[PDB]
Design a protein around this ligand. Structure first.
Ligand SMILES: C=C(O[C@H]1C=C[C@H]([C@@](O)(CCC(=O)O)c2sc(CCOP(=O)(O)OP(=O)(O)O)c(C)[n+]2Cc2c[nH]c(C)nc2=N)[C@@H](C(=O)O)[C@@H]1O)C(=O)O
Ligand SMILES: C=C(O[C@H]1C=C[C@H]([C@@](O)(CCC(=O)O)c2sc(CCOP(=O)(O)OP(=O)(O)O)c(C)[n+]2Cc2c[nH]c(C)nc2=N)[C@@H](C(=O)O)[C@@H]1O)C(=O)O
Ligand SMILES: O=C(O)c1cc(O)c2ccccc2c1O
Ligand SMILES: O=C(O)c1cc(O)c2ccccc2c1O
Ligand SMILES: O=C(O)c1cc(O)c2ccccc2c1O
Ligand SMILES: [Mg+2]
Ligand SMILES: [Mg+2]
Lengths: 542, 532, 538
């Protein structure tokens, strides 16, 4: 049949385009390209992942795409599919993740008259996706076989190109529809894609005088700038570090920089937000994509790289280095002097235990910030986190997807060594949010060396550090911002047959040092009633 | 009073004046103005606040809080994916016509495109699924304009309420109410008043929408009522194949299995029939005329031969007594086959659990059903739904948020009984499959400070399971139901089907797990087909 | 062939649904249902109107619908069709006009890879977006495919005419393409939807000093007929106690009954926004308006108790006569001719049975200021968005539909007059609407009166019209054009005559060509001073 010939053409081109992982979910109707995907899965050409939860499936694809950079597909099958994939698609848009959403519309059926179970469309597709491409019904015309193969494969590489940013340098989600009526022509030789897109280089030089007292702030999506490696740099955990001169985030208010070089999209730390908005401080935004950020409209110029003149003052370097030391010492000393265990303690333990080659997945909220407060040195490490829109949803499956993709890349190198560790640090709310992600059937791929560390302070500790955390709200803030839940984390892990251990913070390093089951949850109970005082103590020790 | 605090207090007040009794709130800092105002209202008894951690299942808790007593319910969340997580519950609320107000905080729109953390294309995210997408607008720091802003804010809130409850449309559904807020978000170290006597700012009397239809009841007629069906006393005598969520209008039941063995000459379709393949087969009969009677402007195109649509029937004649006798005999025969075969069958199936739950119920109970096999099994068991309120997310019939809907339906039902001023609160019994229960197991989660249903029992009919995607159903998931309820601190017990009736008679929230077989399920249904 | 059978079925059901007129334009691809449409037009079941301009073809459909209240179709044909139809569809939404936009997607072709050209407005304007689905080659199931195609067409008409929502408006109807089964007996629609009544009573105390403001889309209320009524031109009248809009600022009503959607008169908005005056909104549809959030309640009809004070009735009637007299006396004293003069002339020349089409800007406002009595007159104006675009074709379509309804009576009398009063910018905006091929239907009694003051007169009466802006406001607000109106109508072969104000009544009394343009030169030099003279006399 032509529909079944079409499916095998697309899947073949998708494999040629670098798609190593595809996610599906049971639904009202068959998945798009399901049979072509099943054939390729048994052949090992591609790895399928099945989940019941459509929401966690979308974030599973996010992890499968950020773990090694490959485009990943998700196959919608139901009417709830658009709604449940929404959060992952929005994140894919903002985090610039190549996420291809597969659909299978039926043009012989009625649209707009009732329950459109193929697609219940929301409004987010019009604003989030890089492209909406539909293949058109497969003609029963064997004379056109040569031509239909060319256009199907050209359109499939179009979907891939839009998803990976091959020509735009702005990866993101793409909607790909392959229509169907109810109820293999070859590609290019040597496994090359039908339409090849060579490496694209968007270039936007900016003149910057480095003799002016400059601090670098690198956030999500930041590039590597070897000509900025010497500068003091306040780097977010997901920012690749260009050099060896880190500036602690808490030292920034103890300095007066005269200009700021902003790499990527920063989302963390109020000292960062205040400095970038300072009208007396020129801010140069260097990005890898067409977008650039601003705080209060204070971005003076945008580019992709810097053409640097001069060099930083040694007196400015030495005083930045000294404040960096003061902030590092205030954290470690006040943490040691603190009686109770907080998430900041847990983050410091997780950070001392990381080894080069590791993959670190950071949940939103306090964990991704605490890891920066503990001064983690990310060099030699791959650090992921859904900074696109900073949700606490889907983090478990993002970690599972990242682990599966990172390990698959390692196995592909053919190295004899153990698959590298994926270690995740997530809050307790974040864990409860995506507990469904732990349920993985026996037929489905499971990570070989993933450890999810759950710092559990029975609620959202980050709100103790905001205006609602001031003691004048202790009357009221417990219920509406603390949100305690009393969840038995161990019992939840037992229900999903996930190896689980509850340990105290001193035991975390040793436990992570010794491998265990392929997937496991380490729970370290923490306190958040002392969190605001602890941060106040660090500020007072600065 | 700073602008965000004033605006949030005006809105919450007008929402309460509009009939909102329950509000679901999920944590965040951008929606802190909404949290503080809703908290005050909860503490003075104006509303009952319910806090949840997962925005998606929290939407289904609000849906349950709406279908339980008929009132509009709002769910408030911070900006970002928290809003996007309400998508599933909005799709269900759209089709099930549920007044669900999605009350989202947002960054100022001026920040959209700047790269601000947790900022996205929020307004219009839901598209055509919501009855309206309304933005309040950023609150101006302008004291002399306070009287004016009070009137615009309150009139905009009543528009949200009117679109949600179908006040003028007769088509209730979800509404997106986006509130852009900026610092200061917390109250700084008197609220502009609404109308006197607690009246809403814009009074909208519930409308009466009327489309009479001429139907001759002499012609051999069968009535098929589905979700959203109305009550039609002039149709009470007719043989009625009623979905469990369709309110009965009389006492002439027609079993769904009996319909294909009869030859009706015309069909009166009440509401939107979803459930049974046999009513689907007859609605595709293009030679049999169908009259569609609905309580709202929408009407099902399930039948290709619907001659006319309306709101009520203007009846002529009366049904042939031979025709009434014939169907009544078909109904007794179909129900006899089901009960005879269930007793002959050796193993306990989900259909046995379903029959046991139906026999246990008494008038005044509220029955919540997972929208898969449980509502299909309870219908085949011949449940008599007269006097009991039956709920089910039949809008899209997804497995998301089923536990949260039962919890929400129970809380709203109990609260309605408490305002009667009466006895112990009425029972709410939920019957859910194991796969659906595990899927929305985190919907069990109720924080210690949060309201707990007083009389909700969740019967889990555990048969360990229900294209390449179906390969996950080749193996029983083997998920510990008891460990799940232990994780969410809910009392759970494993019991046998004949214990079920006595356990339910006993006077918080508990789960009753009933192990069941599904290997013999196909053999049991075939024995029912053969006994017909 | 499946698609031609499907096309005939849909057109047949559309005709059974009361569609009498369909507007098409030559297009890059074939029109949806064009072969089925042509046959129906040849047999006289439906009347086709072809234009080249897609924008004014959309407003031609607007007129063909508001002329007799019937659903009208427009057949998209090209990649600019969606962009050109946008204005009329937005107007069809806010004015609640039964507009069915036909498309024909080709599901065997690629989407999103090259050059229907979608914008963002379809999602926010239409009542429904229904796609019929491709017609399968399956003679076994013809009978079922017939019922499915016809019911879906019934669904499109129900959304367009508001047969169940009481909210007519635009509908997107798609019938897909790849490169006759009968309907119901006695011509009945396949799925019949009887008349629906949305009913929302409101208790109102008529003893409270009440005045009625009725705007676009207002319903007819017998039990409000005695009250003073500041009515808009397009609003039907329930009784005969008119209150001049200029009398409103000199009165203190204690409550206002608001009918429909008022858009005219700054004194009206001031009253409706008055926080000490309760405002009851009575509408025929689900929507309701508010000014400054001061709408106290909404409904469909009033349940009245008590009666207005006779002293209150007398002073309002007195204020009406005083405001009427100030306009007519200041007009007589004014030396130069203005649009207000032209408007007053047009209204005195109107008879019962006439159709009056009012352009936006000053014409629709001036007609109310002249105290036109709209009883017996069908008054049309695009008040939904109040654009100055597409008014020439709206008048043409309104005249054709009005005349077509009269002619179906069979009456021996000549078709009733359709008189349109539009400003000059309005006329230049939709000038291309005058170009009609000899094969296309042309009205027989349309007269387009163009009050030409060589720019936008309404801006003389606003804040930018204050003399302190005299230096700069003429170029950016007056926008003079020096267009030879007579030459342009000559180019399109339209009968046209420039006439003076007192020539208007006599020239409208005797018919001429089926379509003609009566231009009356007018003045905005003195428009502000004229309106100051009227306010001073009040
Ligand atoms: C950091 C600040 O505020 C942020 C602090 C909290 C929330 C936040 O956005 C943080 C996200 C981030 O930037 O990483 C969080 S943390 C947070 C608590 C997480 O608790 P945890 O136990 O997992 O971690 P922790 O207790 O902090 O260790 C919540 C609820 N929320 C709100 C939220 C709601 N729903 C969804 C789907 N995603 C969400 N992010 C944000 C908000 O709600 O507006 C807020 O912008 C600040 O003002 O400086
Ligand atoms: C009436 C007031 O302000 C209005 C003043 C005029 C414009 C208006 O909207 C009025 C339309 C109406 O309500 O009838 C006009 S009058 C107007 C002048 C018409 O001149 P005319 O020669 O046809 O008539 P006139 O000379 O006044 O008799 C123009 C240009 N425009 C703007 C306009 C631009 N483009 C399109 C497609 N449609 C438009 N309506 C409106 C505006 O642009 O904001 C504005 O709402 C007021 O403040 O009371
Ligand atoms: O640099 C990036 O990766 C990046 C990513 C984004 O999603 C942005 C969204 C808005 C504005 C700027 C953005 C940006 O600079
Ligand atoms: O009767 C109802 O309540 C109802 C509700 C709906 O959500 C519908 C959706 C599509 C088609 C028909 C529908 C319908 O008849
Ligand atoms: O009464 C009408 O016809 C009408 C029409 C509209 O387009 C409206 C739009 C917004 C608000 C009220 C509206 C309204 O009352
Ligand atoms: Mg926490
Ligand atoms: Mg003019």
């Amino acid at each position: 049949n032509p529909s079944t010939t079409q499916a095998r053409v697309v899947v073949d081109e998708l494999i040629r385009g670098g798609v190593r992982d595809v996610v599906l979910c049971p639904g009202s109707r068959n998945a798009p390209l399901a049979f072509a995907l099943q054939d390729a899965d048994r052949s090992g050409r591609i790895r399928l992942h099945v989940r019941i939860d459509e929401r966690t499936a979308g974030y599973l694809a996010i992890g499968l795409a950020i773990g090694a950079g490959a485009p990943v597909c998700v196959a919608m099958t139901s009417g709830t599919a658009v709604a449940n994939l929404g959060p992952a698609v929005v994140e894919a848009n903002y985090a610039r993740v190549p996420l291809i959403v597969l659909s299978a519309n039926r043009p012989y059926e009625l649209l707009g008259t009732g329950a459109n179970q193929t697609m219940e469309q929301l409004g987010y597709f019009g604003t989030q996706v890089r492209a909406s491409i539909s293949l058109g019904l497969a003609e029963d015309a064997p004379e056109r076989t040569s031509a239909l193969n060319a256009t199907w494969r050209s359109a499939t590489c179009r979907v891939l190109a839009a998803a990976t940013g091959a020509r735009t340098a702005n990866a993101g989600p793409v909607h790909f529809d392959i229509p169907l009526r109810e109820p293999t022509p070859p590609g290019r030789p040597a496994g090359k894609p039908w339409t090849y897109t060579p490496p694209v280089t968007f270039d936007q030089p900016l003149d910057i005088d480095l003799s002016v007292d400059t601090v670098v702030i690198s956030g999500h999506g930041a590039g590597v700038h070897p000509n900025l490696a010497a500068l003091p740099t306040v780097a977010e955990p997901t920012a690749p570090r260009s050099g060896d001169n880190p500036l602690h985030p808490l030292a920034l208010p103890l300095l007066r920089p005269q200009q700021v070089i902003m790499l990527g999209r920063p989302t963390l730390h109020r000292p960062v937000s205040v400095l970038l908005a300072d009208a007396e401080v020129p801010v140069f935004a260097l990005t890898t994509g067409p977008r650039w950020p601003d705080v209060s409209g204070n971005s003076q110029a945008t580019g992709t790289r810097a053409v640097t003149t001069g060099a930083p003052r040694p007196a400015w370097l030495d005083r930045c280095a000294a404040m960096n030391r003061h902030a590092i010492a205030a954290v470690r000393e006040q943490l040691a002097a603190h009686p109770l265990t907080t998430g900041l303690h847990v983050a410091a333990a997780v950070s001392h235990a990381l080894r080069p080659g590791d993959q670190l997945v950071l949940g939103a909220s306090n964990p991704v910030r605490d890891v920066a407060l503990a001064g983690l040195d990310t060099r030699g490490i791959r650090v992921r986190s859904n900074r696109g829109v900073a949700g606490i949803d889907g983090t478990v499956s993002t970690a599972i997807g990242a682990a599966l993709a990172y390990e698959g890349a390692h196995e592909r190198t053919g190295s004899p060594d153990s698959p590298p560790r994926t270690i995740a640090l997530i809050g307790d709310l974040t864990f409860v949010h995506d507990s469904s992600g732990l349920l993985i059937g026996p037929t489905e791929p499971i990570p070989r060396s993933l450890t999810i560390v759950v710092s559990n302070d029975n609620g959202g500790g980050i709100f103790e550090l905001l205006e609602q955390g001031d003691p004048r709200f202790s009357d009221v803030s417990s219920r509406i911002f603390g949100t305690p839940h009393d969840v038995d984390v161990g019992a939840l892990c037992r229900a999903y047959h996930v190896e689980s251990r509850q340990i105290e913070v001193d035991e975390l390093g040793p436990t992570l040092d010794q491998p265990g089951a392929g997937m496991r949850v380490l729970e370290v109970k923490a306190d958040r009633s002392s969190l605001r005082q602890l941060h106040a103590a660090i500020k007072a020790a600065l």
